[PDB]
Each structure stands twice: as C-alpha cells, then as structure tokens.
Write a protein that binds this ligand. Structure first.
Ligand SMILES: Nc1ncnc2c1ncn2[C@@H]1O[C@H](COP(=O)(O)OP(=O)(O)OC[C@H]2O[C@@H]([n+]3cccc(C(=O)O)c3)[C@H](O)[C@@H]2O)[C@@H](O)[C@H]1O
Ligand SMILES: Nc1ncnc2c1ncn2[C@@H]1O[C@H](COP(=O)(O)OP(=O)(O)OC[C@H]2O[C@@H]([n+]3cccc(C(=O)O)c3)[C@H](O)[C@@H]2O)[C@@H](O)[C@H]1O
Ligand SMILES: Nc1ncnc2c1ncn2[C@@H]1O[C@H](COP(=O)(O)OP(=O)(O)OP(=O)(O)O)[C@@H](O)[C@H]1O
Ligand SMILES: Nc1ncnc2c1ncn2[C@@H]1O[C@H](COP(=O)(O)OP(=O)(O)OP(=O)(O)O)[C@@H](O)[C@H]1O
Lengths: 649, 658, 339
C-alpha cells in the first residue's frame, strides 16, 4: 500500500469556493469558476461547491427572465462541462435553468465531462429582502429528467451522487434557504445515505447573519453525522440594496474544518480533508440514526443514486486537517478550561452521590504523592466540603514498602493522616509463600490494608487508578490498586490528570498553602518504560474507543499530529523541553504494544470494575457502559494489520 | 386487601371442558354444557371452553345442512345465553350458524346474559377424514356483525375479549385446524394483545394425534407468551368412521398446567390458575415480541376489542396451580437429572475456554471442605481432564485461620495439595491496624472475620502470580444475591468463578449427580458423599426461601406480596406438593407466613439495596439457570446506590403479619 | 384593559425544572415535583417541564422492569394529577408506563386535574453509555389511547396541546434523544402548529455534552421558529457509571431566555416569559416555513389537537424577560463589536 496518502486512509478532500461575480455575464462567471476549479484540481480536491446562481449572479432580479441571459447561461454551462473532462473534482455550480414552464434556481452537478444531476432549490424566500418566487419556481417534489446539451439528466430534490470507488463519499446538494426550514432536504438525504452535504448560497450579508449561517450549518453537520460544505456569494453581486461577504465554511459532525476570510478582496476557498471513516464510525454506533431512517422509510428509499468514479490521486498530498496531539486535552485554553471544570465536577458529584447513599461513610485513600492519588484526595475533599462533612472523615494513608508531598498535602488540606509500614507484613507473606510477585505482594497488601481499615473505621476505599491504566491493564488486579469501592479517576485519562491539577491550582479555591504542595506534586512527578509514553497511548485509546479505527489509520493520524514538534499546537503547560516529537517507527512500536494490551491482555481487569463516573466524550472503559468486550480474545488481526499496512519506519 | 385470593394476585382461573355429545340433539348438548358451566361457576372459573361444534356435534356431516338441526341449534344457544346471566365465567361454545349465504363453523363467546362475539373457524380441512368445506364456509377475513337473538354482535376472525377489571386477561378464540397452519390466527392475536388463547376442537383421534395436538398447543403457548386452553370432543360423537378421545389441556408459556383423562367415561374438565403476571412479565422483557408486532402493525391494530366485566370472586378459592418449592431444583427426577447434566457441562466448558485462552495456566483454588469449594474442585478437575492437562496443575489450598474432607478429596483426586496457615499473617495485620483482638479481647468483629477472609484471597492471588495460575472463584449465585461474601479482597474476588450462576439449592444436587454418575472413582465418590453428609442461615435466612424469592424477582420482577403468596402455597405444608429427590423426612421443613414474610423483608433489603455494589464488579463466569444469573454485564443491570424502601413498604401494606 | 399584564401582551410564562431524584422511590420524586410545581404556580407559569423519567429516576436500569416500581410510579402519578387540580401550569412529568406489551419512556402532560396526553420517547439510544431498548419500547408511530386512572387518554408521538384561550401557546413534547436525530418529532410538530417545544432529558453529563445540548436546542428553536424548553436530570440519579449536571434552559428562536446553574446543590428552575407574538410574527413573514409544511402535508395534518383552558393570571406579574433599550445596539460589548 501507499501509507502517506490521505485518500487511502478514508479522507475525501472538499472545497467551498467564492468566485468573482460579474452579474449578467455568464462567460465571465464561468471563467472565474473554471480557474478556481483548476486550483481545486491541483489541490487534489474531490469536490468544489460554488455560490448560489453562480453563472448568472444571484442578485440580478428580473434580469433572470431575459432570454439573452438564459441563453448565455446555457452556453457557459456547456463550456464548463466540456472543460471538466480534465478536472478531478465534482463541480457543483449554480445556474438559473429552463425546465417545463419556468426557470428553476439550480445547482448543476458536473463531473469529468458529464452532468450527473441538476438539483433545484426547494424553498424560495419571498419576504424581507428576498423576491425569489417572482422569477423562479420551487423545486420541491420535482423529479424526472431535464435536457442539458443533448442529454437527459436526473432532475430533482431526491438525488444522491455516490463515488463508486470511494463509498464513504455520498454527496447531496441543497440551496441556501433549503437548510433553514424545519425539515430540510439535506436531513432526509443523510438518512438515505448522504455523507457530504453541499449548500450553494447567495445570502446577502447582514448584522448577525454569519452566526445564523453557522448555527444551521453546524447543527446540520452534527444532527446528520455529516460534512456540510457551504459557499456564499461575494464581490461582484449587485449592491443596489444589499452587501455580500463571500463566506465559505466546511463543517464535520459539529466541528469547523475550515472557513475563509469574510468580505475578502479577491476569491477565496476553504479546502479540508473530510474523514469519511469518522462519519462512518459515528453512524455505526448511533443506532437511533438508522431508527429515524426506518421511521421515514418511504421518504428515504425513494432517493436516486447516481454513480461516478472519482479516481482520486494515490500519492502523498498532505493532510489538510488539524489533528490534536491530545484527543483528551484540547490545545485551546478556553476549551481546556471548560473541560477541566466539567471533569472535576463530574468526579466530585459522582462521589457525592455515593457518599449520600452510604449515609456518609469515611473515605479511605492511599496517598503516595503521585499524580493520581493527589488528584483523588482533592476530589474527595471537595466532595466532603460540598456535603457539609468534616474533612477529618477523609482518612489518608501513606503505606511505605520495601512522597512527603503526600503528608504535606494531607496536612495542608487538614484530613486525617496516618502512616502504616506494610514491609513486615510483606516479608511475612513473601516468606510464607517461599519467595513481579514481590511487587504484587506489596501492591496487594496496600489494598488489603485499606479495605480492612475501611471495614474497621466505617469507610469506603477510594479507587485511584486512571483511564489510561485501565486501558493498558497497568494495575494489580483483584487484591491490588485495580480494586476499590468507588474510583473517581476511572474515566480520567492520564494526559488530562496533570491539567486538572493545574486547574485546581489556578482556581485557588483550596488555600495558597494547598496550591504550593499541589504545584510541588506537579513539578516533582513530571511505567512509560514498558507500556510507552501515555501521550501516544491516550491518542490510540481515543481513536479505538470512540471510532474503532483500524491500526494503520491510527498510525497515520498520530504521525501527522506528533512527528514534528514545531507543527500544530500544544495545550498550555508544556515548556519547550517537554515537547517531544515521535517518528513513525516509535508510533508503530507503541501501537503494537497498545493493540496487544488493549484488545487481548487487559480486558479481564476492566471486566470486574468498581463503580465510578464517565468523564470524556471519548468514552470510559466500564464493562457496564462504553466497552463491552471478551476477556479471552487474541489481538492477532490488529497486529497483522500493523504488519501489512504500517511502514517499518 | 385480601391476601389469600388468587384473583387479587393476578391469576385467572380457566377451564377446558369435554361434554357428552348427543349428535343431532342441541337441547341435550346444551343441557350438558349448562351443567358443566355451573360446575365451572362453582369453581370460580373465569373461562370455560367446550369442544368444536358443541351444540350440534362435530361429526354429523350433511345433517349440519338440515333446517331442523340449524333451527334447534339457535333455540338452544338462546337458552344458554339466558342461563348464562347467572354464571360467572365466559362460556365459549361451538355452534354451526347461518350467516349471509352459508353456515359457518363458529365459537359463540357468551357472558352474563349476552353474546360478546361469534368467531368462525378460518381454515376448514377437506382432506383425509375431513370434509368440512362441503357443509361449511371459511371464516378467514369475515368481519362485521351477525344477528343472534335480536342483537347484532361482532363477527369475525379479528376479535379480542378483554376483561375491563382484569387487564391481564385478554381472550382470543380459534378453532381446531386454525392452530395447525403456518400462520395461525392466534399468533396475530397474541401480538395484538391476546394473553389467553382458546381452541375448540373436534379432532377425531388417531395414533400419534394427541402428540400433534400437544406439539402445537405447547409451542403456541411458548412462542406467543400465552395460556393456550384446548378442548376436544369425546363420547357421543359418531363412530361411523372415527373415534374420539375427549382430550382437554391447558398450557402456559410452554408448560402444562392441567390435562384430563383420555377416553374418559363421562365428562371431564381441566381447571387451572393462569398466572397473568407471569405472561405480563415475560412480554415486558422480550422486546423482540413487541418488535414482531410493530412489523405486522396493520395486521395487529385492526383487531376489535370487546369489553366485559368479569367481577371475579374476591375470597379464598385456593390456588389450582403447582408451585415448586425449588424454582432452581425440579422435583421430577428425570428433569433434575437433565438440569444437573447441563449445569455441570456449562460450568466445565466455561472454564475450559478460559484455560485455553490463557494457554493453560495452573488453577489455584482454596478448599475448605465446604459444598461450594468442593464442587468447584470437581469442576476444575473435569475441565483439566477434557483439555488433556495434568491434574497436578490444579493447586489446592487449605488455609486454616483463627475440612479433612478437603485434603481427602484433593488427595483422592490427585491434584497438588498444600496447607498455608494464615493465622500469623492475620495477627500481624490485626495488630498493625490496632484491633482489640491483638491485645487479647475476644472481639469477633466483622473486621476480624474479614482480615482472615481477605488474607485467604490475598494469598491465593499472590500464589497465582508466583506459580503462573489463575484463582478460581468459588461463591455461588445465592451468595451473590444476598451480598453474603467479603467484597474486594475476599472471596467475592477471583479470576474466574465457575459457581457464580449456580444457586446454593442446586449445588448439593450437582454433587450427587457427580457421585451418581461415578466418573471419578469410587474413592472420590466416598469423600464427596462425606462432604454432603457433613455439610449464617441465621442472619440471611434459609437459602431454600431466598433462592425461591431470587427466582421470582430475577425472572419476573414479581412484587413482594406475589412472591409471599407463591412461597406460602409452596412451603407452608410439608406433605403437600413434591420434594426433589434427596430429602429425608426430617429435612422437610414447612414455613409459616410469618417466616416467609420475615425472610422476604431481609431479601428485598439485601437484594435491591445493600448487595448490588458486590455484584457490580464481578469476575467472569457462565450463566447456568434459565432463571437468570447476576452478572452486571448480563441479566442484572441495577444501581449500587438505591434504597429498597418501596419493596419493604409493599410488604408492610400487603402481606399479613402471620 | 389591564396594561401591565404580561399575559395580556401575548407572553406565556414557562419553566424548566430540575428536581431532586430519589431513584426507585416515586412518592419521593412526586413530592419534589409537587413542590416545584407549586413554586411555578406562585410564579404564574403556564408550563413546567421536568426531567426524563421523573417519577422513577432515569438511571435505575433493570429496576424499571420491577412490578413494585411500576406500581408505585402509577400511584404517584395519580396523586400528582389530583394535586394538579389546584395548580395553574401544565405539568410535563416523566414516567415509565405500561402499555400493551411493554413499558414506554413517557412524558405525562397533566393539567388542572386531568391527563391531557401521554407521549412516548421515539428514539431509544442503545449505544455507548445508553441501554434504553433493553427495558423500554420505542414510541415512534404509536397512536390511540392509554388507560391512566380510569380514563382513556391520547397516546402517541403525534400530539399537540393547545390553549384555547391563548392561541399562541401550542405545546409539543419530545424526549431527550428525540431532538438529536436528523428528523426530530419536534420539527414536524412545529410545522403542524406547535409553538412551544418541550424536551424532558436524563442526559448523563460528559465533557462537551452541555455544548451539544445547546447546539441542538438552540438550532431547533431557530429552525422551528419556536420556544424550546429543556430540563435535564440532576442530583439523586445513580452515579454507578455516570454523573449528572441538572442543566435547564429555555430558548426562543435562537436566543437564550434563561438557564440554570450547572451541578447545582438543590433544585433549580429556569423561568421565562416567551413572546408568542414574536414567534407568530416570524412565522407570518417566513413563507418558506409554511411551504415546508405543505410539502409534508400528510405528515403534518395528522397531529391531534388536545384543547385545554389555561385561564392565566390577569394582573401585573412583571416580565421575566430581558428587553434591550437599543434593539439595534447590543449591550454586550463582544457582540456590539461584532455588529
Ligand atoms: N485473561 C485472563 N482472565 C483471567 N485472569 C487472568 C487473565 N490473564 C491473566 N490473568 C491472571 O491475572 C494475574 C496477572 O495480572 P495481575 O495480577 O494484575 O499482574 P500483571 O498485570 O502481570 O502485573 C502487574 C504489573 O503492573 C505494575 N503495577 C503494579 C501496581 C500498580 C501499578 C500502577 O501503575 O498503578 C502498576 C507492576 O509493575 C506489575 O508488573 C495472574 O494471576 C493471571 O493468572
Ligand atoms: N454501595 C457501596 N459502594 C461502595 N462500597 C460499599 C458500598 N456499600 C458498602 N460498601 C463498603 O463495603 C464494605 C462492606 O462489605 P464487605 O467488606 O464485603 O463486608 P460486609 O458485607 O460488611 O460483611 C461481609 C459479611 O458476609 C459474611 N461472609 C463473609 C465472607 C464469606 C462468607 C461466606 O461464608 O460465604 C460470608 C460475613 O459474616 C460478614 O459478616 C464496607 O467497607 C462498606 O463501607
Ligand atoms: N507508598 C505508598 N503509600 C500509600 N499508598 C500507596 C503507596 N504506593 C502506592 N500506593 C497506592 O496505590 C496506588 C497505585 O500505586 P502507583 O505506584 O502506581 O502510584 P503513583 O505513585 O501515583 O504512580 P507512579 O508509580 O507512576 O509514580 C497509588 O495511587 C496509591 O493510592
Ligand atoms: N479453611 C479454609 N481453607 C481453604 N480455603 C478456604 C477456607 N475457608 C474459606 N476458604 C475459601 O474461601 C471460600 C469461602 O469461604 P467459606 O468459609 O464461606 O466457604 P464454605 O465453608 O464453603 O461456606 P460455609 O461456611 O457456608 O459452608 C471457600 O469456598 C474457599 O475458596
């Protein structure tokens, strides 16, 4: 295979273009369109959407009904179609066209020298600044064919254009106002199989209108588990009563892939790589989406599927797509902040309800001065505060084997702190057994002690292990740190933990003295030896748990995010010496460890998991929630996929 | 309320009657029917189904077409209807009736002085000994009304009769051949809401025909989650070319509630209490049943619902129903044997797969000489045998605290046996924690009990890490149910629990099964026998009672008072009903309502509220019983932080003190 | 006339409530609901929406299938209905209810002593943290009636509740997941006449989920030219595998009227005055909205319209609504800057 190719990893490259309108002059419009389409070709784009009524200009009013204008529009269309024989992408260009008795506001789907379909606008606004019914007929419920340059081509609202060599790409087109009505044509189309929803728009600009466009294109892409590709008219449209801003944008399942400069001087394009596998994966999992389809069966099976062969470029054309290094840790500081706020409150209110139900037992927790146990202590304290419980009911324990951060924190917090040396009990145990086992004896004895103390002192044992450890099965199962009465950290991956700790510092709700210890814990604490860097395994975890992406897809993504430390963004808090870059060889190596550990070795540990709250939209690993899987399965096929598909280095 | 009333607990009493046919003489047939219906009334029955063509006789052939015969049938029907004003049950009686152009083979649904509906047979056999098309029209797709004694009453295949004061009781009727076709009218009816399916039959008898009747009545009751009430013609029918056996039977979701003597001299009835709550519960849970309905929406919403008010007797009328003392342990020896065979093989193959997947680790198991650990050791041994593994790869441990059966068994089996005294480690731990026992006081704490229980598991896990094995869990389903186990570090935890789905009441019977089969030598049998003979009930109650409650709750979700009614009918009287094999006369206790109530309170509290967090983090192991297992990944998804207040309150308000 | 009265100016006062869940204990939930409903009465609210499965708790899983739970839910419902004889607002309260073969996830529309309708959730998520199909039947395409306390009342996804003395207030109800599918029930309902769209939600909370809820409630209120009234579950729901944030919000044609504190200690309400005339005016003008209706004529005329008389308070009850002094000049500096 050809591993650096975005197309071979399930991306499809799409473009939303805003050209230079010359109102009333189709040849000029077509020349601008042709020139932008050639650019899109050069970029390896599979799709290029233009503004509403591209070929005539949207704003020319009764000029639309002039014979010479309609004649010139047809002549220009035919030239485009002919030029398109040498162009990679499907071009979606607007045109007022004659059909039966009237002119329809249409989008003309053009590919490799042929017209694939012609789609009329369904809803024609005739209110405020809009007069569309005056010149143009509604397309809703038109079917059949239309005659364009000596061919009969599909015509109507019910069309789907499907790439026969790229099944994740199924195109539907609507027009401007179409997406603003309670039941848009695009929403039935997605149910029928459309994955990429195009919109050609005129859209005179107005205070707050760009927000309206966004609210609707974004919600559409989210509700319809689709890419939404949008292109509005700019410079050149008539300013007799209106102004135009040239806005273009591309959305994917709620997320902005790209957008262009508003009120540009000159033409602009948004170009992005859409992840069809992401959309595929979201739909596979959200059954209620298919349920909705079945419920509108007749509405949804009546669409007509026009096939074409894209034949996209096979080689390296980069990845026009932002890939976060930390799926669980947003690089944008406003967002990271929001996430931390939510994580923390989730953890706390999860624990509060447990305590309420147990009529407020004491909280037993082993504190080692490590990141996980520190954060848990803080979570426990806040829980107890919010529930009006004395902090002295939290029973913290240092359990030395064979750090001072731990006693310092407990003391600053004002919980009950205690030390218990497990060493002698360990020796006694090691000897009685005739002695990994030696590490497990200590790990087990810690949990054993904590559970017995909890029995004795009327408390529950707080679990401490994080989601990343659950994922790799990095924990001692049974009698060991895997086991507890309630685990507040179970849904928090390791990459996010350090950020919650800062959040709690930065907010400063626990005094200045507490913050200093916490700061110390951080500075001191920053395993990865045998299971690899958690930044890489948390990356893989998100891809697998959310999308079920195959290993080579995960390696491609991780490599685009991580191979170059100067590229992309780092969340806040990474001084310049903590900004590693990973080679493909490293990413491959750790991925092998990951799939082996995650699919095969580690499930039985998750299988018997104490209670605790889901935190990340990426998923948690509860066998009672997000991850139902066998404890007795090999990972052969994943390892084999990495062998066959991911280059050695 | 009125606790000893079967109606107030959701039962409906149904009857399948076989009368005395007098062919060609409707007055006589009606007199027989009237007499049987009065008996049914006396019995508090809500329903009485008679044989096909009751009023004329099924076998009279072209005599069905005679005006005087048809006129007499009508006259007789109207007298029944009038007599029925004083009768409790809905009577379903057969009659050849004129409608439009022809006579239809009908069942006339009759209640408290009115005709509720008339239902024509849908499929009329005209082959081998059957000539029904010659005299009678098919009913399939007839609708509308028909005129019976100056009233227009519903007519057709699409009727449902619903008790307005007893919503679990929704009656559908079909006729004989109707239940034998690939898509019977009764199957669309059950989808539409019918819960009790009636069948009036003529059914000349033939070698092997009673089996056919049962195969189809039983499978119908099972596939349609319903009661199926069936009545065939008997003595009196013409023996010109045929004989008749008078068979009657009542099925409920695949189970025979009642049947009557074949070839009786005289009339016979099958009378049984149908549990509408059981049918309700099965349907609530099997969503694919509702799914089937929605897929045949148009077919299923077109039924017409005729209402009637039953107004059943409110008092004590007994319970015409067999209630097993041991929902998990069948009293019938053939059946118990089948169950044991299956339980055992399930346990074993469950463990074999785990071992295969772990590339054959050693098996570490704590053996205390108790029932659970004994049975597990056996299970382990068989697993190893079938996988061609040396028995010396099973590592059994006695773990004495502060029995010889245990070392005897391990030794006879030939596994690796070893003792480890956990007492010193325990002392060291009790002292390290500052427990009063370490300075002398006899504080037989729970902490003190848990230190030992915990240390056992801790040891076993460490040995497992050391010696390359997995720890076999040992706790049984009944202990999972009551949260009777030490959670976390303790006997609740393990790498694979083969006993997790086996309730305690069944364990002793698996041990005998293994003895009785004798596949492990005579020496092994003797120790096992010893374990039995040699082998807490005081804090959680008798497991026979808690296992009974467990089944009701886990399978059906029945409310506490319903469970108490059932347990009391099963258990209050030791001479009543049957005991599985293996209960000598002094192990046959009876329980009072006061006891059953008392333990039920303990059960709902422990099961709905306290114990769930223990189940919530449960090691892998196989489901065994059709009653269910308690894996939070399978049969039982519930909250760890919920109170049982409403169940306790229901017991207070509904179940008498004693 | 009576000029200082919000109702006489075309407003209708609506409330989205988050109560205290006591899982498995319907009497307790109902007591909390009753108490919040009385508050809403006192505020002159016409409408009070509660969280999904209010009476039982959304999170109780197979406990939904327990007879004693379902029995208690019914008893509790009947007491609310009876208490509601003296309450001004239409209460919309969640309840698992038995119908035909199964239990449906329902919202019970209650008003002045009677049940107006019962609406089942249409889309039951069974993925990730959701297992709803295990215990509950889909409501899409259910019609007819259901028996609640000796009455046969409208049942199904196709219901509209219309105030006969306040025509700008036409209520439709959906549930949680209903609003997340490409073609939600609420969108057809708005085309059919619904102006106020209620949503009862359980909605375990998760990083970024509150954004999702907003994106979809806000876009719905905008695309459907309607108020969208939304109430999620809070404290008391089981934290076996999930946490809850108690979020409540009220949208109007894309604009946030009100919202409540996330992860509150105690119960919270969003209360706002919805301008029915504003909705009325937007619809009069955007012909393409009616055009959409006509295009789905058969879909949209099949709704059933249940009438009730609100009889709202006639006097001065203030105006629970922010009115900018400068319709053309936003007071929020970020926004004014954008403009
Ligand atoms: N598929 C399966 N089904 C049922 N049981 C299975 C099993 N696979 C192994 N087992 C059993 O499980 C045991 C192996 O698992 P386990 O006992 O947990 O031990 P294991 O994962 O092999 O070792 C734990 C490792 O994690 C490290 N550790 C320890 C403590 C804390 C942390 C931390 O960072 O928080 C890390 C420590 O360095 C140690 O090397 C064996 O007894 C094996 O027989
Ligand atoms: N909802 C919840 N979520 C998280 N944690 C919860 C909890 N509820 C209690 N806990 C905690 O769990 C602990 C209570 O459970 P646990 O530690 O197991 O102990 P617990 O259930 O209090 O006692 C176990 C009892 O079972 C009997 N037992 C034990 C072992 C074996 C056998 C046998 O013969 O089969 C019988 C023994 O007599 C003992 O009294 C306490 O620390 C409590 O605070
Ligand atoms: N010395 C200790 N004293 C008290 N508790 C401990 C001690 N060591 C481990 N624990 C308990 O067991 C858990 C797991 O141990 P582990 O050594 O993985 O934790 P850590 O020190 O937070 O991380 P790391 O090993 O990566 O520095 C801890 O979070 C803590 O609750
Ligand atoms: N003395 C013991 N020696 C070895 N293992 C033990 C011992 N006591 C308990 N165990 C282990 O822990 C499990 C639970 O112990 P428990 O004493 O409850 O079992 P039991 O004796 O079968 O039960 P019961 O006391 O009700 O007969 C045992 O089945 C076994 O795995």
């Amino acid at each position: 295979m050809n591993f650096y190719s975005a197309y071979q990893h399930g991306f499809v490259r799409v473009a939303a273009c805003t050209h230079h309108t010359t109102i009333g002059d189709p040849a000029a419009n077509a020349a601008s369109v042709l020139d932008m389409a050639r650019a899109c070709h050069d970029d390896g784009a599979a799709l290029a959407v233009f503004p509403e009524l591209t070929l005539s200009g949207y704003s020319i009013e009764d000029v639309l009904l002039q014979d010479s204008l309609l004649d010139a529009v047809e002549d220009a269309l035919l030239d485009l179609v002919t030029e398109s024989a040498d162009l990679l992408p499907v071009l979606v260009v607007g045109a007022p066209l004659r059909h039966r008795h009237r002119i329809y506001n249409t989008a003309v789907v053009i590919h490799r020298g042929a017209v694939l379909g012609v789609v009329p606008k369904s809803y024609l606004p005739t209110y405020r600044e809009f007069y569309e019914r005056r010149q143009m007929a509604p397309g809703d419920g038109e079917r059949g064919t239309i005659r364009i340059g000596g061919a009969d081509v599909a015509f109507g609202t019910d069309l789907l254009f499907a790439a026969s060599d790229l099944p994740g790409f199924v195109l539907h087109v609507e027009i401007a106002e179409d997406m603003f009505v309670p039941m848009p044509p695009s929403a039935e189309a997605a149910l029928a199989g459309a994955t990429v929803l195009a919109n050609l728009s005129g859209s005179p600009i107005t205070i707050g209108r760009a927000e309206d466009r966004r609210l609707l294109a974004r919600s559409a892409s989210a509700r319809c588990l689709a890419a939404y590709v949008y292109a509005a008219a700019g410079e050149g449209e008539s300013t007799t009563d209106l102004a135009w801003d040239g806005q273009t944008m591309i959305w994917e399942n709620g997320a902005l892939l790209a957008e262009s400069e508003r009120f540009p001087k000159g033409v602009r394009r948004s170009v992005a790589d859409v992840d069809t596998e992401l959309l595929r994966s979201e739909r596979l999992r959200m059954g209620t989406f298919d349920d909705n389809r079945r419920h509108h069966r007749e509405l949804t099976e009546s669409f007509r599927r026009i096939d074409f062969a894209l034949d996209p470029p096979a080689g390296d054309i980069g990845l026009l797509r932002e890939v976060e290094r930390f799926p669980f840790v947003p690089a944008d500081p406003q967002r990271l902040q929001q996430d931390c706020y939510e994580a923390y409150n989730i953890q706390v209110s999860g624990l509060e309800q447990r305590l309420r139900a147990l009529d407020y037992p004491k909280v037993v927790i082993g504190v080692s001065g490590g990141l996980d146990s520190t954060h848990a202590l803080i979570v426990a304290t806040h829980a107890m505060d919010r529930e009006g419980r004395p902090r002295s009911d939290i029973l913290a324990f240092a359990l030395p084997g064979f750090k001072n951060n731990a006693i310092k924190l407990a003391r600053a917090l004002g919980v009950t702190f205690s030390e218990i040396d497990i060493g002698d009990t360990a020796r006694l145990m090691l000897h009685t057994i005739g002695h990994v086992t030696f590490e497990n004896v200590q790990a087990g004895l810690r949990t054993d002690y904590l559970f017995r103390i909890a029995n004795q002192r009327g408390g529950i044992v707080l679990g401490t292990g994080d989601l990343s450890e659950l994922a790799l099965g990095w924990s001692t199962y049974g009698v060991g740190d895997q086991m507890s009465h309630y685990n507040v950290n179970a849904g928090v991956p390791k990459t996010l933990i350090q950020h919650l700790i800062r959040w709690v510092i930065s907010a400063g709700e626990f005094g200045e003295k507490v913050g200093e210890v916490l700061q110390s814990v951080l500075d001191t604490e920053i395993s990865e030896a045998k299971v690899g860097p958690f930044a890489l395994q948390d990356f893989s975890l998100f891809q697998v748990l959310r999308y079920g992406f195959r290993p080579s897809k995960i390696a491609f993504l991780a490599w685009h995010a991580w191979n170059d430390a100067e590229r992309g963004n780092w969340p806040p808090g990474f001084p310049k010496s903590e900004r590693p870059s990973y080679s493909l060889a490293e990413i491959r190596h750790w991925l092998q460890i990951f799939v082996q550990r995650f699919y095969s070795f580690s499930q039985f540990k998750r299988s018997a998991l104490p209670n605790g709250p889901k935190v990340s939209h990426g998923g948690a690993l509860s066998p009672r929630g997000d991850w139902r899987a066998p404890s007795d399965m090999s990972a052969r096929i994943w390892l084999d996929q990495i062998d066959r598909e991911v280059p050695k280095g």
